[PDB]
Structure 1
Amino acid sequence: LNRFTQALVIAYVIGYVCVYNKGYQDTDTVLSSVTTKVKGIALTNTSELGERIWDVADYIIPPQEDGSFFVLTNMIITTNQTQSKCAENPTPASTCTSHRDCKRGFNDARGDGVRTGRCVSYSASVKTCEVLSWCPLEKIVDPPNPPLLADAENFTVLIKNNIRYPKFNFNKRNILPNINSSYLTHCVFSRKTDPDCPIFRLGDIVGEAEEDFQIMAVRGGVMGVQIRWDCDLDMPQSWCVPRYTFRRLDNKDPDNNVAPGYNFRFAKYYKNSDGTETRTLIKGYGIRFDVMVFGQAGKFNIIPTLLNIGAGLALLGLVNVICDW
């Protein structure tokens, strides 16, 4: 059996660990850099404001980040805000019977405005603590449904990705050389037909991830666009190609978390003709796209090959001793 185990370990190292595990290569992680450009426009027949356009280029993307990017899909717009005092929103913690309940400063922190000791009426029927803040306060209301920027589904993002492996002084780009420029003029990614088209539709991105753009885009979320560069360096540089994946990253489950979906506040400031400041507060919901790039590669190397082969010999010594037992 001594000649049998010896033929087993030789088929175990060369056959198993050197093609299946490919242990004869040195590893190297990817040094990445990405670039996005979103194209589209969206209409909205607001209740009172009437038809309105949002050019996803300028109006839709706060702000214009490096790798990742954020597409506005839904919103609650508070206007004509000015530095002033006013009534908090009706709430067990905010409600007051008189000047005694309102404490200056402390009752402030809670309702997004600083409380002055004064107690005022939120309306005729009810009364609550006065707060100085950006006024009028933001109404407490649910986001519109369907989403205003529902046209977002049909947007499209061009994703350029240059990568390099420092160790192997090798680099490549997600736009393969065998590609027409007129092709990228109107192509759009799809696993089936056009797999090399770096322009992805937003909906397709969310879809592919087993989700639904229209249900998401109401309260927001974050989509992970994973690009994987797993190349065999010893193979032709032509075989090196990006593998695109798509995940929803945040939790949809209302329980067992907080800040469901994804959203943030931002503002537009306007010097009124009176010289006084006013701002428009915007609670924007949307989908944030995180472009996550990673990978590994390796050519042949004598250092790792000899070191694995060496242990394969010592391992055949034990194996023949395991055959004796």
Structure 2
Amino acid sequence: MNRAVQLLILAYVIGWVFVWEKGYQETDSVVSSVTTKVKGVAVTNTSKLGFRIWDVADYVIPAQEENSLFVMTNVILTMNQTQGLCPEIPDATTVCKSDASCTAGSAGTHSNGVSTGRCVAFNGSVKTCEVAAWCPVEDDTHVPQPAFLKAAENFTLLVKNNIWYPKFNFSKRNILPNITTTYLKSCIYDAKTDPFCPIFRLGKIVENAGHSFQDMAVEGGIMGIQVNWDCNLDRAASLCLPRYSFRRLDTRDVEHNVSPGYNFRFAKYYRDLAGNEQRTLIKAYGIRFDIIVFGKAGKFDIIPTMINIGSGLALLGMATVLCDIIVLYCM
């Protein structure tokens, strides 16, 4: 029976290690560079803003990032803001009846300005505390619904991924060598029809993750594009191909709805004829697209092979002899 036992061990070393686990290969991780470009135009003709055009230079903030990009889907605008004194937005906290309620220097965390201790009139019927800030102050109580830039559902995104394995002298990109300019000009990614077109539609990205673009566009969120490289360098180089998957990354609270979506504030600065600073305040809601790249390569190397061989041999002998010892003890 010893011979039988030793054989099973031989099976383990040959089938599970060298074949199943490819113990004959050396492994390495990937170094990746990602660049993105978005195309699409949105047109709005609201009464307050008039006729507006939104192109790539308008809704992508900033122009370029690393492994990420942000696309604006909803917006609140405050134009003609100047440094001075103004009343606050009326609420349960800022409403005052006299100067006694207001305290000078009450610069809280949520106050967009520094209170001057004076109770001034926001309009004819309400009176609020006066602050020193950019005036008039922003009113963000009514987020637009549906999204202001809901046409972003039909925008397209090109992902250019350059991967490099420093150990094996192997580099390539996700734009395959058999892709032409004519094909790249009019291709949209699909898992079945165009699995290697590197151009994705944003609405399709959100839908493939199991969500709805129009629901997510009102307040924003985080979407994760996962690129996977599983290349065996013993094969041809044309068989090292990427795989794409999508997942929503921001966790949503439905019991309390604490801190939903994703937004930030930025401004565009101007000057008048007199030289005074002026600005437009922009509260931007939108979706951030993170590109996550995983990849490992394998190439045949003699060292790992030999190491495993020795281990298997040792293992076999030890086991067989262990079995022999146990058999005599049982006898």
CA distance in structure 1 between the aligned counterparts of 2:255 and 2:169, rounded to whole angstroms: 48
Query: CA contact under 8 A between 2:76 and 2:140: conserved in structure 1?
Result: no
Question: What is the CA deviation profile of residues 182-240 of structure 1, one whole-angstrom value per residue up to 9, with x for unaligned ones?
Answer: 11111111111111111111111111111111111110011111111121111211110
Query: CA contact under 8 A between 1:254 and 1:260: conserved in structure 2?
Result: no
Aligned counterpart, 1:87: 87
Give the stretch that moved more between structures: 58-67 or 309-318. 309-318
CA distance in structure 1 between the aligned counterparts of 2:92 and 2:166, rounded to whole angstroms: 60
Aligned counterpart, 2:243: 243
Decide whether aligned partners of structure 1 residues 274 and 255 sit closer, same or farther in structure 2, where only a CA change above 3 A counts. farther
Give the stretch that moved more between structures: 191-200 or 96-105. 96-105
Aligned counterpart, 1:103: 103
Question: What amino acid is the match of 1:106?
Answer: S
Question: What amino acid is the match of 1:183?
Answer: Y
Decide whether aligned partners of structure 1 residues 47 and 233 sit closer, same or farther in structure 2, where only a CA change above 3 A counts. same
Q: Aligned residues: percent identity?
A: 59
Question: What amino acid is the match of 1:84?
Answer: G
Give the CA deviation at 1:112.
1.4
Aligned counterpart, 1:73: 73
Query: CA contact under 8 A between 1:154 and 1:201: conserved in structure 2?
Result: yes
Decide whether aligned partners of structure 1 residues 252 and 44 sit closer, same or farther in structure 2, where only a CA change above 3 A counts. farther
Question: Which stretches of structure 1, 4 residues or longer, exceed 4 Å deviation after superposition?
Answer: 254-258
Aligned counterpart, 1:26: 26
Query: CA contact under 8 A between 1:164 and 1:172: conserved in structure 2?
Result: yes
Aligned counterpart, 2:214: 214
CA distance in structure 2 between the aligned counterparts of 1:256 and 1:125, rounded to whole angstroms: 33
Aligned counterpart, 2:268: 268
SS at match of 1:81: strand
CA distance in structure 1 between the aligned counterparts of 2:238 and 2:140, rounded to whole angstroms: 56
SS at match of 2:153: helix
Bigger Cα Rg: 2
Structure 1: 5+ residue runs without aligned partners? Answer: none
Give the CA deviation at 1:258.
4.5
What is the TM-score when the length of structure 1 is the normalising length? 0.93
Aligned counterpart, 2:174: 174
Decide whether aligned partners of structure 1 residues 315 and 96 sit closer, same or farther in structure 2, where only a CA change above 3 A counts. farther
Q: Which structure shows the bigger proportion of residues in helix conformation?
A: 2
CA distance in structure 1 between the aligned counterparts of 2:121 and 2:315, rounded to whole angstroms: 84
Question: What is the CA deviation profile of residues 233-257 of structure 1, one whole-angstrom value per residue up to 9, with x for unaligned ones?
Answer: 1121111011111111111224578
Give the CA deviation at 1:140.
3.2
Aligned counterpart, 2:310: 310
Query: CA contact under 8 A between 2:2 and 2:323: conserved in structure 1?
Result: no
Equivalenced residues, count: 324
1:195 is the counterpart of 2:201: no
SS at match of 1:270: strand
Decide whether aligned partners of structure 1 residues 309 and 105 sit closer, same or farther in structure 2, where only a CA change above 3 A counts. farther
Decide whether aligned partners of structure 1 residues 319 and 5 sit closer, same or farther in structure 2, where only a CA change above 3 A counts. same
Give the stretch that moved more between structures: 184-193 or 268-277. 268-277
SS at match of 1:182: helix
1:227 is the counterpart of 2:188: no
Query: CA contact under 8 A between 1:155 and 1:201: conserved in structure 2?
Result: yes
Aligned counterpart, 2:60: 61
Give the stretch that moved more between structures: 199-208 or 164-173. 199-208
CA RMSD of aligned residues (A): 2.0
SS at match of 1:219: coil
CA distance in structure 2 between the aligned counterparts of 1:268 and 1:7, rounded to whole angstroms: 76
Question: What amino acid is the match of 1:62?
Answer: I
Question: What amino acid is the match of 2:313?
Answer: L
CA distance in structure 2 between the aligned counterparts of 1:164 and 1:283, rounded to whole angstroms: 39
Structure 2: 5+ residue runs without aligned partners? Answer: none
Give the CA deviation at 1:32.
0.8
Question: What amino acid is the match of 1:61?
Answer: V
Give the CA deviation at 1:175.
1.1
